[PDB]
Design a protein around this nucleic acid. Structure first.
Lengths: 198, 198
RNA sequence: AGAAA
RNA sequence: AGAAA
């Protein structure tokens, strides 16, 4: 559930942006109501806004969160934003794609080393699969592909059959037959190394 | 559905093999999570893994199952493994062929008698047809042929028109025109004995 | 756990 | 029941 501090923060955010729906003031209202909540409270506020349907406000909260010092690029966090995004909404869809681009840029922002390259290597497989699943579920075939290609194809994040099947089926039914075939190939390679051989 | 015992077993299996994807440890994890489940639970676990896409794990479960005392070579069981196998996967395809060879060896393992030869004679026609259908559907023309030839041609398992048509059409479209013709001949013989003559 | 073409 | 060239 939500601490009274987070509940009051959400109410505060809504009531302020009510008198002015405009996004410029909406931002200033977010840092005003959510500016300095403990990580746990800010995350709960965000989730509550998503749950209620105030997606644009949830995004505003994300903005605030990105400024916090504890902030870290997290696939699960991004998946909730995709899941809660409005269906049949061109603007929303673009926002989702943009979000995916933001997640990969945030994650890879800290990489300049021949040092053991692992920006994606240590990533949570389940969470990353959840993000991909959500993107597919919302028809963001391209976005899904950027993520897979970034974290698995290049990032060298070791995934499993479940992840592959999700992608292959996703790309297929979404009309990227080209990429579907590549996933199947990646899967084929995987199988070629885990399947008991003789 | 799945007993909580089987659900927990599957979770357990995944979580263990997660820290180590390698097949040697994957096997030890299977006998560790699935080692002593009731037949019903082990079978349900296997099917759930297939459903999720963890085919290599489903195969690991099969290994465990083969050691159980209640285990019996079953065409249906093998068909599910063929159906759930990844398409466009050289390794998988070989695994399927190997599986078919394992099924025929397991079945015929108990035959050393001029006693009424019936290792295949009492076989379930529908299930056996399902296995053949799946193999064809995955392009395993050879594998399909081994089964047919073993159980019907030699094993003396009495099948029906549905089975023949499935094979003939399967071999044809799969490019074994030689074997297709033989099936049609087998069918011709069948017809010659069931068709009302005059 | 990454809930159902 | 062995679901659609």
């Amino acid at each position: 559930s939500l601490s009274t501090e987070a509940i009051h923060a959400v109410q505060a955010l809504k009531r302020l942006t009510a008198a002015d729906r405009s996004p410029p003031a909406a931002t200033a209202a977010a840092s005003a109501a959510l500016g300095r909540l403990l990580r746990a409270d800010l995350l709960a506020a965000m989730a509550e806004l998503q749950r209620q349907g105030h997606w644009s406000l949830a995004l505003a909260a994300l903005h605030v969160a990105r400024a916090e010092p504890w902030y870290r690029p997290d696939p699960e966090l991004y998946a909730t934003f995709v899941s809660s995004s409005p269906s049949n909404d061109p603007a929303a869809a673009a926002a989702v794609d943009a979000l995916v681009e933001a997640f990969i840029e945030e994650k890879e922002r800290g990489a300049a080393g021949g040092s053991s390259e692992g920006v994606w290597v240590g990533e949570d497989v389940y969470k990353l699969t959840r993000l991909v699943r959500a993107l597919v579920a919302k028809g963001r075939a391209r976005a899904a592909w950027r993520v897979y290609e970034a974290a698995v194809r290049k990032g060298g994040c070791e995934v499993d059959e479940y992840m592959y099947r999700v992608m292959a089926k996703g790309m297929k039914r979404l009309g990227l037959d080209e990429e579907a075939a590549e996933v199947e190939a990646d899967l084929a390679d995987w199988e070629a190394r885990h399947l008991p051989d003789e």
